[PDB]
Write a protein that binds this ligand. Sequence first.
Ligand code: CLA
Ligand code: CLA
Ligand code: CLA
Ligand SMILES: CCCCCCCCCCCCCCCC(=O)OC[C@H](COP(=O)(O)OC[C@@H](O)CO)OC(=O)CCCCCCCCCCCCCCC
Ligand SMILES: CCCCCCCCCCCCCCCCCC(=O)OC[C@H](COP(=O)(O)O)OC(=O)CCCCCCCCCCCCCCCCC
Ligand SMILES: CC1=C(/C=C/C(C)=C/C=C/C(C)=C/C=C/C=C(C)/C=C/C=C(C)/C=C/C2=C(C)CCCC2(C)C)C(C)(C)CCC1
Ligand SMILES: CC1=C(/C=C/C(C)=C/C=C/C(C)=C/C=C/C=C(C)/C=C/C=C(C)/C=C/C2=C(C)CCCC2(C)C)C(C)(C)CCC1
Ligand SMILES: CC1=C(/C=C/C(C)=C/C=C/C(C)=C/C=C/C=C(C)/C=C/C=C(C)/C=C/C2=C(C)CCCC2(C)C)C(C)(C)CCC1
Ligand SMILES: CC/C=C/C/C=C\C/C=C/CCCCCCCC(=O)O
Ligand SMILES: CC/C=C\C/C=C\C/C=C\CCCCCCCC(=O)O
Ligand SMILES: CCCCCCCCCCCCCCCCCC(=O)O
Lengths: 107, 80, 38, 37, 505, 67, 30, 342, 30, 30, 30, 37, 37, 38
Amino acid sequence: KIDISKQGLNSIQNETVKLNLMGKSKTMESKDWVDPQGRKGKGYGVYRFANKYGANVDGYSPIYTPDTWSESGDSYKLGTKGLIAWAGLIVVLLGVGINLVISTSAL
Amino acid sequence: GATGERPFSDILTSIRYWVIHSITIPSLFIAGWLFVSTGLAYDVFGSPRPNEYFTEDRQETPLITDRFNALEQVKKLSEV
Amino acid sequence: AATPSLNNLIGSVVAGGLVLAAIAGAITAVSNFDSIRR
Amino acid sequence: KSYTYPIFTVRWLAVHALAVPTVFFLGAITAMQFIQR
Amino acid sequence: GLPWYRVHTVVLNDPGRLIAVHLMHTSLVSGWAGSMAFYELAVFDPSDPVLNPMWRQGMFVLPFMTRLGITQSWGGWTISGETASNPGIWSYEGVAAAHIILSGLLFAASIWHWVYWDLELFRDPRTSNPALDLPKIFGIHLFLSGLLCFGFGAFHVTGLFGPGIWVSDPYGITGTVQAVAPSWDATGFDPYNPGGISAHHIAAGILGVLAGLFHLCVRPPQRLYNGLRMGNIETVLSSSIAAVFWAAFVVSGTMWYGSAATPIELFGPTRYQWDLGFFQQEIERRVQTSLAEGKSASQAWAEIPEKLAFYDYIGNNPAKGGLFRAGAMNSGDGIAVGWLGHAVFKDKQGNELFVRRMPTFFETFPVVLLDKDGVVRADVPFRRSESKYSIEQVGVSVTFYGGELDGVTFSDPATVKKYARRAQLGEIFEFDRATLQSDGVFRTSPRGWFTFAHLCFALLFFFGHIWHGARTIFRDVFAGIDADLDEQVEFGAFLKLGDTSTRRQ
Amino acid sequence: DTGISTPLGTLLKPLNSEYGKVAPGWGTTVLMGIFMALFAVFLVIILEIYNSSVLLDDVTMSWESLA
Amino acid sequence: NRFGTIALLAVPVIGWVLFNILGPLQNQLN
Amino acid sequence: KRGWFDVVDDWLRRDRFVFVGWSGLLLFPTAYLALGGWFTGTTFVTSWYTHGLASSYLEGCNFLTAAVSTPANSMGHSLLFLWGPEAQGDFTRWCQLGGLWTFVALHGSFSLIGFMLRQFEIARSVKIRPYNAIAFSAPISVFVSVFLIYPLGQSGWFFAPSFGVAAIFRFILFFQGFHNWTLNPFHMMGVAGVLGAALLCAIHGATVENTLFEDGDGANTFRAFNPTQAEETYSMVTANRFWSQIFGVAFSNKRWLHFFMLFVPVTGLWMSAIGVVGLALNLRAYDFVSQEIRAAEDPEFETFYTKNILLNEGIRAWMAAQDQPHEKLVFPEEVLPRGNAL
Amino acid sequence: MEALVYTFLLVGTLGIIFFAIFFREPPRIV
Amino acid sequence: VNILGVIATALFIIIPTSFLLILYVKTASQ
Amino acid sequence: VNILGVIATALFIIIPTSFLLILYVKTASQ
Amino acid sequence: AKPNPNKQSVELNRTSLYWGLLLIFVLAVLFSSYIFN
Amino acid sequence: AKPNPNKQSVELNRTSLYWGLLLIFVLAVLFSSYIFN
Amino acid sequence: GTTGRIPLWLVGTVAGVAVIALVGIFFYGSYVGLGSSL
Ligand code: CLA
Ligand code: CLA
Ligand code: CLA
Ligand SMILES: CCCCCCCCCCCCCCCC(=O)OC[C@H](COP(=O)(O)OC[C@@H](O)CO)OC(=O)CCCCCCCCCCCCCCC
Ligand SMILES: CCCCCCCCCCCCCCCCCC(=O)OC[C@H](COP(=O)(O)O)OC(=O)CCCCCCCCCCCCCCCCC
Ligand SMILES: CC1=C(/C=C/C(C)=C/C=C/C(C)=C/C=C/C=C(C)/C=C/C=C(C)/C=C/C2=C(C)CCCC2(C)C)C(C)(C)CCC1
Ligand SMILES: CC1=C(/C=C/C(C)=C/C=C/C(C)=C/C=C/C=C(C)/C=C/C=C(C)/C=C/C2=C(C)CCCC2(C)C)C(C)(C)CCC1
Ligand SMILES: CC1=C(/C=C/C(C)=C/C=C/C(C)=C/C=C/C=C(C)/C=C/C=C(C)/C=C/C2=C(C)CCCC2(C)C)C(C)(C)CCC1
Ligand SMILES: CC/C=C/C/C=C\C/C=C/CCCCCCCC(=O)O
Ligand SMILES: CC/C=C\C/C=C\C/C=C\CCCCCCCC(=O)O
Ligand SMILES: CCCCCCCCCCCCCCCCCC(=O)O
């Protein structure tokens, strides 16, 4: 019912985090998998009815989907000149603010 | 599960967002500091400064007794 | 005659009407500007 | 695919109405801590 | 089967049996009115209307009968203490008997309407199914209500045909039933002006007749019909419950704060008349007026009515009772029999002292004596090891002016303390705590009981209105939601919430 | 199964004959809203009179108005 | 003048914001 | 959709991050104004001229001791409008006279009305039943009875509660000292309902979490669920058997379980509201007359009820002077009730 | 006189509890 | 102590109890 | 007059009445 | 005339009987202690 | 073990209900007059 | 112009440090100045 590829989780660099966000883990479906305490697995995986219902709750309602992110915002349009102007403005504003705070107080 | 607005995690990790908001938040903080330090807070909302809780006329707590002359009574009680 | 309290009451009624009219006008403006085309 | 989102929305207005006075009041309260009786 | 809380829903779609059950309810209410009137008549003591009024005896429905102009009884007495002259049919007993007979007749009519439920008047002509045309029925009933309101306000209150209503002077000393003329200016909205009642009833009756004609003539809009579910009988129930809890709040506020429709001579003084010095200020003004006329203090204090003194009593204050202190105020304080007199406390040097009166909030109050400038001069100490304002040290004495103890001076410290303890409650009186074996704790008056009961009813009926409105609007999902619903509730599936014709985004 | 016939039921029958008859559209909703607004203003005025939030020359608003 | 100081402080903030966001705002409006 | 109503309804009932709806026009402005009024009163506005205290951060109070104070007792039950015959349009003197309390209360009541209306509207838009909207009636009744009905039956807004932590604590202590509120059967039902609701919440959470089904291979059981699944995620049979053998009785109906969960706290709060409505007219279950008479006749009879009575008398006597400045109570130190050496 | 009523009320409540525990309608798996 | 509390307590115990017993016996018979 | 006669009369009226009502309602339902 | 088509039969199970009895007896305990005074 | 084979159902008709009510109320009249004393 | 995004964990760390510093300032001001009992 749920297509994992259409959930917007295909733009994640870290493979382990990407598998975690879909509620999938290739290791745990193996019949010889043993968790830290030492209990064998029954082959269910993270979720038993993953094939019946498509995916897990993690793969049903994700809260971090880089695919839906806007193509803008990862690069600043104003470039280096904008950053230089911002640096000048922030230095000027910090100086003005500290001067106003000192002057209006009782020294 | 998208209602048609930019994701919050997309906005909060933007150079443009942190360039705009490196000015607005400190500006508001300084504005509040100047509002308190310049004495505007006392005058706008009528709170007593530490040196004007008790006047030379009365040395007890204020008490309002009239409902329709309440404005004039509180004007008289607040006299410095 | 009319006391100052009556004048303030009438002014408050008019101001409430003005607030309702402004809210309704703003809502109508935004609703007409951004509509749903079925 | 390309995703383009509006910049000012109802959520923008709600967030800023809740946030701007909060920062102003926080600055005022921080200034309040250094007053001497 | 039906749960125990859904039993009365069988008559929802049965107009005949709905009429039958409403008739049964009306019969029960009329029977209660008649029986309560008879029970109150069997225990009422009309011997003394000055110090033993109706409210001290704890009568509930009797003041409501007296308010509309009923003052005589078949027993020969009158509510003012005079002798009845030709009581006629409309006495207390006559009204109670009329209510009983009406209850019996309504019982019979209810039986008839329950048995014969299949009248063709209740069928829909175009479908032959039981139905009611609620807008036109509302028009008819609104017209009738307006007619009745106009008739009452024009003939009863004004005295054109009926007797009138109870009107009394501001201090509740001289009050009789009299005709009231309408007041059409801005003074008609004064809650303490009796003419507002008749003016309001005339104007509201005319408007009700006009609105009833409008609702008889004009059909409801289609959008309003669909929105308010005018084809359902439960929306009428929700709206009526809203109206009645609104009215309950209004009447509770009016009774608590006092108005022209709740005389103190019939229901009792309010707490604001005590905590603001109404009767005390009036008494002092009368005393000063007498004193300026070249009379002695005893002569000035001897012309004050005992009723006016009795009104100045925290025992008569209605905010001094308890939730489980049952019975009349006579059952808690005793039957008052006489006014002892005005206790005047004097310092050993001749200066006069005043006892600080006990506020309404406090169940117990300390005894302190103040001078005319408000400075403490004497008290009854709790720690007697060291004392600076003790009555024994100061030497305070009490003298009574007027009343039973006129001219008697007490100087014994124990007696002085005992009389200064009773000066907190106001005017010292003499009570009879043996006839009814009064325990000694203050009770509340019909004012307090009415206000409490109707506030509770108003809150419960607010809940009822909410429940019934929710049930009538959400009627199709009363048994449960649809089997498959996830597509409609999917986030962002449609531009509009719940609209399948705006699928996008 | 038409129902039980009765002279009084026949007399009152035309008063219960139009069940679903409605006026198309919004009808007289605006007039009803105007009357509702006037009622709200009147209620506010009288509530403020009782609350002593408005003071009128002739109106006393006290027990002394019974004089 | 005390409120004028705060208004003068606020003016460059709105100026900077308008300088930064004007383009995308105009794009959204159209 | 062509009409004005239709287009306005199309825009208002839109699918957004924040749902506005038709009830938003009443909810959002009033709720925003109430929140702003509280935050302004607790930060800048004082309480010197109406109570004789300091109730702001500007005067040196923390989160616990800062509050929006009530008007003076002289103002009675006045609604205290900004344009009324008391403030007369002066904002600073309106704040000094205590008009922010009535502002906050009057806007908060309409915000509550708007919130229940919003619950109704959202429930109808999604085509479900309005039981969540029915459940809000208990908080609304509590707010209405405590903040409006009780002051309306008393001297006035001065004896109304104030909006703060320590102010609410003072209100509670006053209710104990003067009304004997702990001895009220309606309050007893209210506290029983609240504690039973907490019990039900904890027990249901634990029972569901400890009867889960094995739908995965990992020790983290939160990831073995899918909201669109058909089968239930825990064993109702096992839960029922466990609680039948441990307690004696147990639930066998999920619908009845969850309706009981809804029913308990609502009934408790409604009973408490009825009790406070009764207390508004000083109709307090304060004393037992038989016990008082027996203790008066016999100087050896003592119970915990008499000790509570003495404690209430002490509370009243020692709090009256400062809590009610309008009464101008001057009490010599030798009339205040007091024990030996304490 | 009232002590008898109090004891009767408490005993009746305890008996109701006992009967509810030991004479319940048994759940049946469908 | 109010001697009228005995009759009130008895009525309040008995009448709802009889109503519930009527309903339950009818249901169990059915 | 024995004030204990009110409770006796009420109990004697009510308990057999409730027993008869239980039996009759069960029979009529059946 | 013809039998009423709105005929329904009430019901009450043992759980409801126990709950009602418990409610009645607990209310009786509390308010009897308060009414005897 | 097996269900009890001695199961019977009681009954009471309207005539019996009326007779029982009448007997109860007449006895109540007589002996209440005699017990109030 | 300037490709890249600020790390979300860095944003969270800075915000947490800021709020902790604010709370610390509030406590210090509770220990000295107005409402410090001395
Ligand atoms: C406490 C909240 C509350 C809630 C959630 C509801 C909810 C509901 N009402 Mg009820 N109602 C209430 C209180 C409430 N009511 C009050 C106090 C009254 C007055 C008696 C009514 C009277 C009433 C009627 C007559 C009807 C309903 C019906 C309904 C249903 C939907 C229609 C509706 O939205 O009406 C709108 C309800 C409102 C409360 C919103 C209006 C907001 C007001 C006008 C604020 C304006 C502010 C004011 C003028 C400021 C100045 C005042 C100042 C001087 C003090 C729904 C069950 C309708 C129905 O469908 O029933 C089946 C219907 O027929 N209600
Ligand atoms: C969203 C709805 C809303 C609602 C329901 C309220 C409700 C309330 N406000 Mg709030 N308020 C709001 C938004 C709202 N406010 C906004 C946006 C602001 C601006 C910041 C304020 C600012 C505010 C202040 C400054 C005060 C209040 C106060 C109050 C009370 C006003 C009493 C009054 O007499 O009203 C007016 C009466 C009415 C009945 C109005 C309805 C009249 C109808 C519409 C008739 C129209 C007819 C008219 C003759 C023609 C006008 C049309 C033409 C002019 C275009 C009431 C509890 C007061 C307070 O709380 O005191 C303690 C007060 O001091 N409010
Ligand atoms: C104006 C009158 C009024 C009327 C005609 C109705 C009518 C109805 N109600 Mg509503 N209701 C009202 C007010 C009213 N209600 C109020 C004020 C509340 C809030 C408490 C409710 C809350 C309410 C609920 C919670 C429910 C209903 C339901 C119903 C339906 C079935 C009732 C039932 O079978 O009870 C049968 C009742 C009993 C077997 C015994 C009840 C005895 C009570 C607890 C005390 C004894 C009462 C006493 C002798 C008389 C009261 C005095 C008077 C001052 C009130 C029926 C349509 C039911 C429903 O919606 O059905 C689908 C339902 O579930 N109502
Ligand atoms: C060794 C054991 C140690 C612990 C012993 C515990 C004993 C207490 C058990 C009480 C059971 C009573 C349940 C009645 C009603 C009953 O029969 O419950 C049984 C009921 C049956 O549920 P179902 O799912 O079968 O209901 C189906 C629906 O159709 C019902 O309409 O289950 C519950 O509601 C559980 C909630 C128990 C709530 C307990 C309330 C607290 C007890 C009050 C104590 C008063 C003391 C007074 C002293 C003077
Ligand atoms: C302190 C004073 C003590 C003396 C006065 C006592 C007053 C109360 C008298 C009645 C006592 C209980 C009578 C029970 C009648 C039914 C018989 C029965 O349970 O058969 C089992 C019955 C066995 O019959 P079978 O099913 O055919 O095998 O088992 C059942 O499941 C039958 C269905 C009914 C179960 C009980 C229903 C609820 C009964 C009332 C619960 C409360 C009773 C009072 C508790 C306090 C007493 C102080
Ligand atoms: C047949 C007939 C007759 C007769 C009749 C009669 C004799 C009647 C009666 C009636 C009656 C005699 C009635 C009564 C009723 C009553 C009621 C209906 C009551 C009720 C009550 C209630 C409901 C209460 C409640 C409560 C309580 C319990 C406590 C507190 C709270 C309350 C208030 C809630 C005649 C010959 C005349 C004519 C012909 C026919
Ligand atoms: C009054 C008034 C008004 C209004 C106003 C407003 C609307 C305002 C607002 C305001 C606001 C809106 C404010 C706010 C504030 C806020 C704040 C001040 C906050 C704070 C916070 C904090 C302090 C935090 C803390 C914390 C932490 C850090 C940790 C964790 C936890 C928590 C979160 C708690 C107007 C003019 C219209 C009219 C007249 C009157
Ligand atoms: C991210 C995140 C977060 C966080 C936050 C925060 C605020 C943090 C912080 C952190 C930190 C802030 C850390 C730190 C650390 C440090 C360390 C670890 C240090 C060490 C040191 C040492 C070891 C030292 C030593 C020494 C000595 C002893 C002697 C002399 C020399 C020296 C100085 C070297 C939150 C929760 C928001 C959310 C989630 C995410
Ligand atoms: C009831 C619906 C909306 C209500 C909003 C009410 C008021 C909005 C704010 C008004 C500010 C005060 C305006 C009138 C002041 C008095 C004017 C005068 O003195 O004449
Ligand atoms: C819809 C309501 C209809 C009618 C009532 C409306 C208004 C009546 C008010 C005033 C008109 C008469 C008074 C005119 C001013 C003179 C006042 C005076 O001299 O006392
Ligand atoms: C159908 C209803 C029955 C009608 C009953 C009519 C009789 C009721 C009144 C009986 C007593 C009337 C006179 C009372 C005289 C006793 C003196 C007194 O009232 O204190």
